[PDB]
Design a protein around this ligand. Structure first.
Ligand SMILES: *[C@@H]1O[C@H](CO)[C@@H](O[C@@H]2O[C@H](CO)[C@@H](O[C@@H]3O[C@H](CO)[C@@H](O)[C@H](O)[C@@H]3O)[C@H](O)[C@H]2NC(C)=O)[C@H](O)[C@H]1NC(C)=O
Ligand SMILES: *[C@@H]1O[C@H](CO)[C@@H](O[C@@H]2O[C@H](CO)[C@@H](O)[C@H](O)[C@H]2NC(C)=O)[C@H](O)[C@H]1NC(C)=O
Ligand SMILES: *[C@@H]1O[C@H](CO)[C@@H](O[C@@H]2O[C@H](CO)[C@@H](O)[C@H](O)[C@H]2NC(C)=O)[C@H](O)[C@H]1NC(C)=O
Ligand SMILES: *[C@@H]1O[C@H](CO)[C@@H](O[C@@H]2O[C@H](CO)[C@@H](O)[C@H](O)[C@H]2NC(C)=O)[C@H](O)[C@H]1NC(C)=O
Ligand SMILES: [Cl-]
Length: 627
């Protein structure tokens, strides 16, 4: 096919076109992007004196463990403590371990920071060393440090110790440990609370993020971060929704919450840590506010909304407000950030097409109040576009789609037929998740993708050429879900996977990165792709440099030739770069073969005319300079 490139741009490409969608799903927060290495660190939201309260914790030797509703808890937010008792007549090493999130990476090039709170609930003559450390799951000690404690310490006391492994472990089957001498400790009871183990963090942020994962997200060159969900915003009930104020301040003051994917969230990855990550990466937030629906099906009545609308105003004030004018903005100042953060976009709820009977009134009351307080923010509606009809008229809608790879190349003209009437669209969740049109959300045996494939990434890329062509009205687009702990999965496929030790960049991650990193501010119209066809392209140009990015998706099983005609330009560089992602149709990056499919960069000859053969199942970017 001959593709004529117009030199005259049709529209400016929004700075926000490509970004990320985050919720704590598949242990993407706890266990994932948040760097904390101990699971169930503070006994949040568990039933005392049950086995589940002790999840991830194990005795060493004859130690007696229980999770208790502490008569004198470490804080209002953390009512539970680990009661540790050493039997009469004990000896040697007695204590307990934490298995981490399916392991702990023990690296001798890393210093770890261990902390806990303890008290003796009954004053005693105990005198001896408390030891913390890391050990292989055989009990082989790799790091250890200790400090002297006394049984006369009946008030809550924090211990802070650094750990330096003598050797890197051969795998991630390691545990954190706390021990005392069994003979010196015989008959003693200690109460513990609020444990923590951190490795070095992204940008050395206190209370920060896991370095490999955060660097992988930054590598993708995102412009926005949609958070905190997603289903994980909503809760199962009003009382279990996400709440911004429970996520800020000391970790002692964060009660956690049962999230929407089977596990407790610490809320250690809270509002200020999200905003700090945006600052560190140059992303802006697309921040959701709870909108009076939870996933057990309860809508708040119209006459119940007021306090929840005020909470949403308080949440935005934390982010942008003048510290002299509100308590939440003074709190941001008090936590070391007096300058407001950037916030231009707020999403009202999540997937309110599930509660379309109530969303008209919830949308109306939330947006009337929030637009009055925040006249510069753009509020995004979550129902299906224009059904039901909302008031006020939404300036933006969030569109989600999970479909087959084939649907994605067949629907690359999704936005071409939309009216241009001042509405902008966020593709806030999309993914090609299955090859089975009959059962998209079924099992891997029934066609669900365990991991993104070449087929699914190339279908996506064809659809993304439409997003870019239609970027006059499409302002933002994110794959979902972003992250996956391969040891605790609730949804596949995911953009980036990991275990406790290493990261797996999917084929779809590479498609996302090739689109995002190779994007100009000018959209250059070109010969249209065949609507329904397997072959798609989108061309942008950087006004400041003339760097021109020709993105090509062949989502089909046939190689296809393209001849580009740049005759309308004055000059075209005599060479260009080619970046290509390709492979067999069903190929994936997996924990066992994490680099099976990776992009290849080369130099090609270019000019006012050149020919490229787009291989079957490929994503290609050709960069040239045009003036
Ligand atoms: C985070 O902030 C929210 C408010 O934006 C706090 O929720 C509010 O908590 C108070 C005190 O528990 C609630 O009032 C209580 O209501 C009950 C039930 O009718 C009544 O029996 C009590 O005397 C009291 O008035 C209030 O309704 C609730 N507001 C909302 C919107 O949920 C929340 O506690 C804060 N979280 C943390 C950890 O501080
Ligand atoms: C045990 O942990 C203590 C506390 O983290 C370590 O001592 C700290 O070492 C750092 C780094 O040199 C200093 O900045 C701190 O001032 C030290 N604090 C104290 C109270 O000494 C100690 O090095 C660790 N020991 C081992 C064997 O890992
Ligand atoms: C932008 O254009 C769309 C498409 O015509 C309008 O959408 C229609 O909205 C009405 C209600 O306002 C619905 O009953 C129609 O079914 C919608 N049409 C389609 C094809 O979805 C939308 O109203 C327009 N928005 C503005 C701000 O003018
Ligand atoms: C976490 O998941 C990894 C990745 O699936 C598991 O490691 C694999 O274990 C399987 C099944 O035993 C082996 O066939 C693979 O060869 C392992 N792959 C790799 C890349 O190591 C691991 O066992 C899981 N961890 C836990 C605690 O369940
Ligand atoms: Cl398909």
């Amino acid at each position: 096919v001959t593709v004529t490139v117009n030199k005259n741009p049709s529209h400016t490409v929004p700075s926000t076109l490509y970004g990320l969608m985050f919720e704590d799903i598949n242990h993407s927060g706890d266990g994932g992007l948040y760097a904390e290495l101990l699971q169930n660190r503070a006994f949040q939201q568990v039933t005392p004196n049950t086995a589940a309260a002790l999840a991830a914790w194990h005795p060493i030797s004859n130690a007696k463990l229980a999770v208790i509703q502490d008569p004198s808890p470490v804080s209002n937010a953390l009512p539970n403590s680990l009661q540790f008792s050493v039997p009469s007549g004990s000896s040697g090493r007695v204590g307990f371990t934490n298995e981490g999130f399916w392991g702990i990476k023990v690296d001798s090039t890393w210093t770890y920071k261990a902390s806990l709170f303890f008290r003796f609930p009954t004053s005693s003559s105990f005198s001896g060393a408390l030891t913390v450390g890391l050990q292989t799951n055989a009990g082989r000690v790799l790091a250890q440090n200790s400090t002297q404690i006394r049984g006369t310490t009946t008030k809550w006391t924090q211990i802070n110790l650094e750990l330096h492994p003598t050797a890197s472990a051969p795998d991630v089957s390691n545990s954190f440990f706390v021990t005392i001498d069994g003979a010196a400790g015989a008959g003693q009871t200690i109460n513990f609370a609020m444990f923590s183990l951190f490795p070095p963090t992204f940008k050395n942020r206190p209370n920060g993020l896991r370095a490999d994962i955060a660097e992988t997200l930054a590598e993708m060159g995102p412009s926005f971060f949609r958070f905190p969900g997603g289903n994980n915003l909503e809760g199962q009930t009003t009382a279990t929704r996400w709440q911004w104020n429970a996520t800020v301040g000391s970790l002692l003051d964060r009660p956690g919450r049962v999230g929407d994917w089977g596990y407790v969230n610490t809320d250690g990855l809270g509002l200020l840590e999200y905003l700090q990550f945006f600052e560190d990466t140059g992303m802006e937030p697309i921040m959701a506010v709870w909108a009076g629906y939870s996933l057990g099906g309860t809508s708040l009545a119209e006459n119940q909304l007021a306090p929840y609308i005020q909470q949403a105003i308080d949440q935005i004030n934390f982010v942008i407000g003048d510290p002299a004018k509100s308590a939440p903005a003074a709190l941001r100042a008090s936590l070391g950030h007096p300058e407001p953060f950037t916030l231009r976009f707020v999403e009202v709820g999540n997937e309110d097409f599930f509660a379309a009977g109530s969303y008209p009134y919830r949308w109306h009351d939330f947006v009337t109040a929030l637009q009055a307080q925040f006249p510069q923010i753009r509020f995004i509606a979550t129902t299906n576009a224009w059904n039901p009809v909302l008031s006020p008229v939404p300036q933006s809608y969030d569109v989600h789609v999970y479909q087959t790879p084939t649907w994605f190349y067949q629907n690359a003209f999704y936005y071409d037929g939309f009216q241009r009437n001042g509405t902008t669209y966020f593709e806030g969740e999309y993914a090609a998740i299955s090859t089975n049109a009959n059962d998209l959300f079924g099992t891997v045996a029934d066609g669900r993708l365990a991991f993104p494939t070449v087929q699914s990434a190339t279908g996506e890329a064809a659809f993304m050429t439409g997003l870019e062509r239609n970027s006059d009205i499409v302002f933002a687009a994110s794959y979902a879900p972003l992250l996956q702990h391969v040891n605790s999965t609730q949804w596949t496929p995911d953009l980036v996977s990991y275990d406790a030790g290493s990261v797996i960049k999917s084929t779809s991650f590479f498609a996302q990165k090739l689109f995002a990193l190779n994007k100009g501010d000018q959209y250059l119209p070109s010969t249209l792709p065949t609507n329904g066809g397997t072959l798609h392209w989108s061309i942008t140009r950087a006004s400041s440099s003339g760097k021109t990015f020709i993105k090509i998706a062949n989502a089909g099983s046939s190689a296809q030739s393209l001849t580009f005609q740049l005759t309308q330009f004055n000059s075209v560089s005599s060479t260009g770069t080619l970046q290509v992602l390709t492979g067999p149709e069903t190929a994936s990056n997996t924990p066992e073969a994490p680099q099976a499919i990776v992009p290849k960069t080369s130099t090609i000859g270019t000019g006012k005319t050149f020919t490229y053969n787009a291989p079957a199942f490929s994503v290609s970017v050709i960069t040239v300079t045009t003036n």
